Amino acid sequence: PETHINLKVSDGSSEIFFKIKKTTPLRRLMEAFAKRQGKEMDSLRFLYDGIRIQADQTPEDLDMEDNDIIEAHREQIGGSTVVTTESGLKYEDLTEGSGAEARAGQTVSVHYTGWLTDGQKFDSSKDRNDPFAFVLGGGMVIKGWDEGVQGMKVGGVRRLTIPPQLGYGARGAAGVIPPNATLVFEVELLDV
Numbered sequence: 001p002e003t004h005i006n007l008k009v010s011d012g013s014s015e016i017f018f019k020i021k022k023t024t025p026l027r028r029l030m031e032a033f034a035k036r037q038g039k040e041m042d043s044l045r046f047l048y049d050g051i052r053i054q055a056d057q058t059p060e061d062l063d064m065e066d067n068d069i070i071e072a073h074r075e076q077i078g079g080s081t082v083v084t085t086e087s088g089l090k091y092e093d094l095t096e097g098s099g100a101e102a103r104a105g106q107t108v109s110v111h112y113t114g115w116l117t118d119g120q121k122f123d124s125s126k127d128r129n130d131p132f133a134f135v136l137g138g139g140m141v142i143k144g145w146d147e148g149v150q151g152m153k154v155g156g157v158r159r160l161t162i163p164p165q166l167g168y169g170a171r172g173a174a175g176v177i178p179p180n181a182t183l184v185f186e187v188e189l190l191d192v
């Protein structure tokens with residue numbers, strides 16, 4: 001407790017905790033975060049109390065205390081935009097796609113991860129090495145997906161925050177999704 005510190009890293013979807021010595025440069029935490037997430041260090045920007053962290057700075061330098069939060073930002077440089085549509089769906093483009101645009105009628109191919117609002121992962125197509133294909137705009141998937149995947153471009157990564165009436169509602173999903181749950185997905189569009 002004297003020499004080490006526990007810190008929370010949030011990326012807006014989930015959280016991972018790290019314990020490092022107070023004299024250890026944050027590089028070690030940043031690298032551990034990047035490796036666990038399968039991301040390049042150079043793709044990530046870290047903030048503490050709104051100030052950009054540099055990798056050679058220590059918790060001691062920044063007067064950090066146990067359970068302080070570091071934000072990890074993977075989204076495009078220049079300032080994020082969370083869009084709320086008329087349905088109450090929210091979406092945020094973490095990566096802007098460069099390819100073909102997804103439109104209703106297409107059988108599109110994606111990877112996804114889904115979390116509850118407390119950051120617990122409930123599913124991932126990547127964890128089973130299994131891209132997911134569906135008829136976009138067909139009513140075959142939950143409403144937040146039909147609405148939210150429309151307009152993505154191939155290469156894009158979009159975060160959907162789906163209120164339960166656009167998800168599984170009061171029923172939930174057996175074994176997996178509670179009644180009245182808000183769902184967070186990161187969807188990566190692979191093909192249309």
Ligand SMILES: C=CC[C@@H]1/C=C(\C)C[C@H](C)C[C@H](OC)[C@H]2O[C@@](O)(C(=O)C(=O)N3CCCC[C@H]3C(=O)O[C@H](/C(C)=C/[C@@H]3CC[C@@H](O)[C@H](OC)C3)[C@H](C)[C@@H](O)CC1=O)[C@H](C)C[C@@H]2OC
Nearest residue numbers: 112114122123124132140141142145167168169173176177
């Ligand atoms: C024969 C049927 C099996 C068939 C299963 C598959 C092809 C495998 C496929 C990878 C699903 C996953 O299997 C591991 C698993 O994905 C979740 O974990 C998940 O991440 C999720 O939420 N997804 C999946 C990705 C698209 C968004 C959403 C969805 O819309 O999923 C859809 C869904 C469940 C829609 C319901 C349908 C009933 C409506 O009444 C309800 O309306 C509220 C909405 C899925 C894709 C359906 O179109 C097709 C199926 O169900 C669910 C939490 C539970 C689900 O297992 C069942």
